[PDB]
Write a protein that binds this ligand. Structure first.
Ligand SMILES: Cc1cc2nc3c(=O)[nH]c(=O)nc-3n(C[C@H](O)[C@H](O)[C@H](O)COP(=O)(O)OP(=O)(O)OC[C@H]3O[C@@H](n4cnc5c(N)ncnc54)[C@H](O)[C@@H]3O)c2cc1C
Ligand SMILES: Cc1cc2nc3c(=O)[nH]c(=O)nc-3n(C[C@H](O)[C@H](O)[C@H](O)COP(=O)(O)OP(=O)(O)OC[C@H]3O[C@@H](n4cnc5c(N)ncnc54)[C@H](O)[C@@H]3O)c2cc1C
Ligand SMILES: CC(C)Cn1cnc2c(N)nc3ccccc3c21
Ligand SMILES: CC(C)Cn1cnc2c(N)nc3ccccc3c21
Ligand SMILES: CC(C)Cn1cnc2c(N)nc3ccccc3c21
Ligand SMILES: CC(C)Cn1cnc2c(N)nc3ccccc3c21
Ligand SMILES: [Zn+2]
Ligand SMILES: [Zn+2]
Lengths: 228, 226
């Protein structure tokens, strides 16, 4: 009995992203997994890191330090309920899948907000407690990303660089930092440009992958993996 | 007479980020430059990319498609159109922010997602050196929790150039900006009072001659070469 959280960042449910989210729900549900989806746009998730994230009185009201205050709030159990509700879902999940379109070589801001606000000190990492000793150690994470650019554009010799280069802040700087074991990324290249049958192939490939997701070895999340 | 836009993403004005923002306003103001600051948190800037960003003039909503067409029909939300005006006027755009998860805080990511729309910041074709903001300069002034030693090839975080790539190349260069070398103020929370004043003074001092700098070559070799 494995539990999966899908953190989904797309405005349109009929989108290619929406279709990949639905494939994941359908296939993981079919296997018997416990499935939860955080539909960020539908939730209107707050993305901004503010003092509204701590309920009640701050440790230092005169000089606001987001990091210090959220860490203390986590320990005193006074974080905002949107945050705590996402932390419960992550705590319980064996696998967290992130489903998003690539925005500026990164995640859409609503998803960046999830990362900034949910993955607080005391919950996702601590001193000590980062990289392999991160507080979410043992859990799996997978980035399922769609792009505007084609696969041939995302090469070492192409204008955009290797797709692996943009993965570094997400996979290493965020997910590994918090102790996640990172499964290989699912990159669905250029669905808007691809033919209908290429798009169906990409959907079929993700469906197929999901069938054996629990047998996968994670990647070695190193500078060498990302940059060669 | 040079025009500078500072896009500033910090909650507290007494922070180390607030201090670096203030030093930039003070020094550039002293020089006689025109200075505008977009204080994103104080503005409560909308970060989310939604259909509310198109203000007038379908079945399946594609943010990229609709915002591009909206930009051409002069029908983007006023927060966007106001930021675009500031960018259009600016000779230099300084981004002042603490590093959050090897990137910009979400509020600033929202500024990038929403302000730099197709037709305004780039076209296809019309990116990288053909980007629409060609002739302008951008500079990332970034603070970290991690120490400088941590941000090396043999440190736990890897080379700082590795996190700069999506921002400097993938975003700024893509829109046609020429990128001045980043100002990275490592670990002010950990530094002594003296070391901190040093880092503030180093930014102030660099700004005195910022108009004589040449931008970096925003290439893969620059970011990954060694
Ligand atoms: C602010 C911003 C920044 C961006 N930055 C970048 C960047 O840095 N790099 C980059 O490469 N790209 C970038 N993009 C482009 C973006 O990554 C793509 O537009 C996005 O990945 C497309 O995915 P989608 O789900 O929106 O596609 P959609 O437009 O929803 O889908 C494409 C097609 O697939 C169809 N479809 C849906 N479901 C199925 C199905 N089951 N079977 C077959 N077909 C189906 C849809 O009907 C549609 O015709 C950016 C876009 C924006 C708005
Ligand atoms: C969600 C989140 C994600 C993060 N992710 C990362 C990451 O991926 N990598 C990373 O390295 N770090 C990360 N951090 C840490 C973050 O980058 C640092 O906390 C931030 O950069 C420090 O800058 P600050 O302005 O907030 O420092 P402050 O705490 O404001 O400054 C430190 C000290 O300097 C003092 N000060 C202010 N002005 C002056 C002056 N003129 N002279 C002398 N002293 C002064 C202040 O009073 C304070 O005591 C993250 C933090 C958060 C909350
Ligand atoms: C919105 C899509 C129809 C295309 N698109 C939109 N924004 C962007 C962007 N920053 N980089 C790109 C790089 C290659 C191909 C497409 C895009 C792109
Ligand atoms: C006046 C105060 C309430 C804030 N403040 C304090 N010192 C300074 C300073 N050198 N430059 C600034 C530049 C812009 C805005 C505020 C300040 C500032
Ligand atoms: C230490 C120098 C920079 C002078 N200075 C001292 N305090 C201040 C201040 N609050 N605002 C300013 C605004 C513009 C230029 C200089 C200053 C300034
Ligand atoms: C080890 C800390 C002293 C600083 N640090 C170094 N790398 C990172 C990182 N990815 N996220 C953070 C989030 C909050 C606070 C510090 C960090 C951080
Ligand atoms: Zn790693
Ligand atoms: Zn570049």
């Amino acid at each position: 009995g494995k539990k999966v959280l899908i953190v989904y960042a797309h405005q349109e449910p009929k989108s290619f992203n929406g279709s990949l989210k639905n494939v994941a729900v359908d296939e993981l549900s079919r296997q018997g997994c416990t499935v939860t989806v955080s539909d960020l746009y539908a939730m209107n998730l707050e993305p901004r890191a503010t003092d509204k994230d701590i309920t009640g009185t701050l440790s230092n009201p005169e000089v606001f330090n987001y990091g210090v205050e959220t860490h203390e709030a986590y320990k005193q159990r006074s974080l905002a309920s949107d945050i705590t509700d996402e932390q419960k879902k992550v705590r319980e999940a064996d696998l967290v899948i992130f489903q998003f379109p690539l925005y500026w070589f990164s995640v859409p801001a609503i998803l960046k907000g999830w990362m900034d606000r949910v993955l607080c000190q005391g919950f996702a990492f601590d001193i000590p407690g980062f990289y392999d000793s991160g507080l979410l150690q043992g859990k799996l994470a997978l980035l399922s990303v769609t792009t505007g650019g084609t696969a041939e554009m995302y090469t070492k010799t192409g204008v955009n660089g290797d797709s692996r280069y943009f993965l570094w802040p997400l996979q290493h700087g965020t997910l590994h930092f918090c102790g996640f074991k990172v499964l290989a990324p699912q990159i669905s290249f250029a669905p808007e440009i691809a033919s209908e049958e290429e798009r169906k192939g990409m959907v079929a490939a993700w469906s197929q992958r999901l069938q054996t997701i629990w047998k996968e070895e994670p990647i070695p999340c190193t500078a060498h993996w990302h940059f060669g």
